[PDB]
Design a protein around this ligand. Structure first.
Ligand SMILES: O=C(O)[C@H]1O[C@@H](O)[C@H](O)[C@@H](O)[C@@H]1O
Ligand SMILES: [Zn+2]
Ligand SMILES: [Zn+2]
Ligand SMILES: [Zn+2]
Ligand SMILES: [Zn+2]
Ligand SMILES: [Zn+2]
Ligand SMILES: [Zn+2]
Ligand SMILES: [Zn+2]
Ligand SMILES: [Zn+2]
Ligand SMILES: [Zn+2]
Ligand SMILES: [Zn+2]
Ligand SMILES: [Zn+2]
Ligand SMILES: [Zn+2]
Ligand SMILES: [Zn+2]
Ligand SMILES: [Zn+2]
Ligand SMILES: [Zn+2]
Ligand SMILES: [Zn+2]
Ligand SMILES: [Zn+2]
Ligand SMILES: [Zn+2]
Ligand SMILES: [Zn+2]
Length: 737
């Protein structure tokens, strides 16, 4: 019956033999403090006593990182803006972005940066914010969200798993190992991962997530394919279902939300209705990439994973920045299309599709910076006008917006009704009640130390690392298949292999990784060449209003067209404009005089927009804003030096679905693997045969740039291209001894 309580500011009262937190400090048991009552009655009572500004503060969510004190040496103290956000803006939702890890030897507090914090220091920080929250007039608790933390970057003290697509590759591979088929996957793999994450996140007082991503990698030119699970909507739907059930629980409320005190992490699924199908792969963080296009008419396949998570009870939904171009309204009158504005401003999307058509009963969380930076389709509108349009469109909380006074001002100007603010307040407050946070919002920092990165948790991650690896090619030689490796030999390594780790398996290693000013030993005479390679963007020089770049006629024109709902094309988006002409620094269609460029330095990722279709390794080596690592030139020298290329093992990190073009010579390697993030001993354990590979690709790979240029950005695979796929979805070899 009686749930545990903890209070550091307010007092505990007991009534009818039960104890309660007196959060308004009146000395009596209000219904919102009365945990015996159903949540709607607790919310109604709480919303009844809030001032307008306290209600409007709930509609903001902003970065609140732990800081360090240069004079005490303590890490995990409150930042400067904590007092403002909690006490002046009345916020109770925050994004925690610090790396959680143990700092080296010698690290002292200094610099503008975001300090690294241990698990115990992270818990101390979030407790302190909860302490400051309880100290407010009604002592409403706070909720921290974060992006993903448990993935190897090819994190910190959290237990390390492969990237999202590696988890899907492992799930498909274990289905095929049990059934013979690779369709929707073995979801015990996903549940095992989610179980470790939920336990570790909750132990530091991190009870929400910006994620996971249900977006589909149907457009290989989209730089965010690196954080998608799959291109296939039905596998994605099965994964989102399992993530909600495991992270939120299977216990549903009467509203149909999987929210209980058993909820370890409440998910804010992103990015609705699906960020995958970007025109030319250009991303809507950037002005030139506002458009999402659906040439194969698959808009409904893309919100199918969201559908599945909504039914499993997911807490929260984040719309993407994108603009849906000419999309028929689901369940609407004939000839109706969705507005050509960003998703969070469209009542048709957030209230119509998400709530009315799909039945979502939770709250809606904007993506970060839609108001000031990415108010797509609202370029001429003011900031207050943009706030009202997102809130009235169905968006309940604004990520990256700080200023509660703008919402109160919009109320006094009758641009947002108080009935709408009450509705947002209800949706935002209910999960905090249902998750037990009004009763006890604190955590034990020392239990975090014993939980984050536990040995058994790390073991689960290691298993999935080994099961994510996909064997794509393993050529038969006179002495048998290239893989697994034989015992002993001379091994040449290139790329991110640790020499002593490879030596430890009983090989003599020659390291081709030399600095730019030293000569590289030849690979001649090696029994094996281990190359670990990938490609990266190097687009930090991009400037939208620079005639050398964004305004350079030699870079061509942006083919993307978006006709505004007023009848005029969006700036720089008429299909004839220079790439940089869509940036507000160029068009200046707002209220405000020389606006900064939003696209400068492409700081979120992605190549130069004129280079977004160069996904082949040969093209990428020559491209201005792509880089092959190690260089394709060095790789090609090395493969010639060994003379017999079947002695070369390529381990490739397909950050995007890169194209192994025949001109590049990479297909002459004896073995090719796709890796999604592993320790060196996990990969050496598979290469040397202690374990056999079993992963299967959760997206198809193409063989030509033409297939890249021809495929439909909203359709999976390459079956409609002339050249087709090099490797299809669900493909992957093993050792057959
Ligand atoms: O972390 C954030 O605030 C968000 O940043 C935005 O740029 C991304 O679109 C979203 O996926 C992140 O969750
Ligand atoms: Zn007191
Ligand atoms: Zn009573
Ligand atoms: Zn009270
Ligand atoms: Zn105030
Ligand atoms: Zn408040
Ligand atoms: Zn990445
Ligand atoms: Zn199911
Ligand atoms: Zn786009
Ligand atoms: Zn009035
Ligand atoms: Zn303790
Ligand atoms: Zn454990
Ligand atoms: Zn054989
Ligand atoms: Zn030696
Ligand atoms: Zn020219
Ligand atoms: Zn150029
Ligand atoms: Zn003005
Ligand atoms: Zn050379
Ligand atoms: Zn496609
Ligand atoms: Zn051709």
């Amino acid at each position: 019956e009686q749930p545990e309580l903890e209070a550091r500011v307010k007092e505990i009262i007991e009534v009818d033999g039960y104890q309660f937190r007196d959060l308004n400090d009146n000395g009596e048991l209000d219904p919102y403090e009365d945990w015996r009552l159903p949540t709607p009655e607790r919310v109604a009572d709480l919303v009844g006593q809030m001032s307008l500004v306290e209600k409007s503060g709930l509609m903001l969510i902003n970065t609140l990182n732990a800081a360090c004190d240069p004079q005490t040496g303590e890490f995990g103290v409150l930042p400067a803006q904590a007092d403002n956000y909690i006490n002046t803006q009345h916020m109770h939702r925050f994004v925690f972005r610090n790396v959680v890890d143990v700092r080296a030897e010698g690290v002292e507090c200094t610099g503008t940066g975001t300090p690294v914090v241990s698990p115990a220091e992270a818990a101390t920080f979030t407790n302190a914010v909860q302490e400051m929250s309880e100290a407010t007039r009604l002592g409403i608790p706070s909720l921290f969200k974060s992006n993903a933390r448990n993935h190897i970057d090819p994190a910190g003290a959290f237990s390390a798993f492969p990237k999202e697509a590696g988890i899907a590759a492992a799930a498909l591979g274990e289905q095929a190992r049990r059934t013979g088929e690779a369709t929707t996957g073995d979801m015990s793999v996903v549940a095992d991962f989610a179980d470790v994450m939920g336990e570790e996140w909750a132990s530091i007082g991190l009870r929400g997530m910006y994620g996971y991503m249900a977006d589909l990698s149907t457009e290989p030119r989209w730089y965010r394919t690196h954080e998608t699970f799959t291109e296939d909507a039905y596998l994605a739907a099965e994964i989102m279902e399992t993530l909600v059930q495991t992270l939120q629980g299977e216990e549903l409320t009467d509203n149909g939300l999987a929210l209980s005190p058993q909820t370890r992490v409440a998910l804010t699924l992103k990015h609705f209705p699906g960020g995958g199908p970007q025109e030319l792969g250009l991303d809507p963080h950037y002005a030139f990439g506002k458009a999402q296009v659906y040439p194969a008419g698959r808009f409904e396949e893309h919100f199918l994973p969201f559908q599945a998570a909504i039914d499993a009870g997911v807490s929260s939904i984040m719309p993407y920045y994108g603009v849906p171009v000419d999309v028929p309204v689901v369940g609407g009158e004939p000839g109706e299309t969705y507005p050509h504005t960003g998703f969070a401003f469209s009542d048709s999307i957030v209230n119509g599709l998400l709530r009315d058509q799909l039945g979502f009963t939770g709250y809606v969380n904007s993506d970060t910076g839609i108001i000031n930076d990415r108010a797509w389709g609202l370029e001429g509108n003011t900031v207050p006008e943009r706030v009202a349009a997102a809130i009235n469109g169905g968006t309940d909380t604004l990520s990256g917006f700080s200023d509660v006074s703008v919402i109160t001002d919009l109320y006094e100007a009758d641009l947002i009704s108080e009935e709408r603010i009450d509705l947002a307040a209800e949706r935002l407050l209910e999960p905090l009640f249902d998750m037990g946070l009004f009763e006890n919002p604190y955590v034990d920092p020392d239990v975090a130390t014993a939980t984050v990165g536990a040995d058994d948790h790390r073991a689960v991650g290691l298993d999935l690392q080994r099961k994510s690896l996909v064997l794509l090619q393993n050529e038969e030689t006179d002495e048998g298949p290239v893989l697994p490796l034989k015992e002993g030999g001379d091994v040449y390594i290139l790329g991110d292999f640790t020499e002593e780790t490879v030596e430890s398996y009983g090989y003599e290693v020659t390291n081709g990784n030399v600095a730019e000013g030293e000569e590289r030993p030849s690979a001649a005479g090696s029994d094996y060449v281990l190359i670990s390679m990938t490609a990266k963007t190097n687009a930090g020089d991009y400037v939208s209003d620079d005639p050398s770049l964004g305004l350079n006629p030699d870079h061509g024109t942006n083919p993307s067209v978006i006709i505004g709902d007023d009848g005029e094309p969006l700036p720089g988006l008429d299909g004839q404009s220079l790439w940089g002409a869509a940036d507000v620094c160029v068009h200046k269609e707002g209220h405000e005089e020389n606006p900064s460029c939003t696209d400068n330095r492409l700081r979120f990722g992605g190549a130069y927009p004129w280079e977004s279709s160069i996904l082949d390794f040969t093209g990428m080596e020559a491209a201005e804003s792509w880089e092959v690592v190690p260089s394709l030139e060095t790789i090609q020298e090395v493969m010639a030096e060994v003379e017999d290329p079947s002695k070369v093992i390529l381990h490739v990190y397909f950050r995007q679905p890169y194209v192994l073009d025949e001109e590049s010579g990479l297909r002459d390697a004896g073995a090719i693997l796709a890796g999604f993030g592993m320790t060196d001993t996990a990969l050496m354990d598979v290469l040397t045969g202690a374990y056999a590979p079993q992963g299967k690709l959760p997206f198809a790979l193409a063989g030509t740039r033409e297939a890249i240029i021809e495929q439909d950005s909203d359709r999976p695979g390459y079956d409609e291209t002339e050249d087709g796929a090099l490797y299809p979805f669900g493909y992957g070899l093993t050792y057959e001894d």
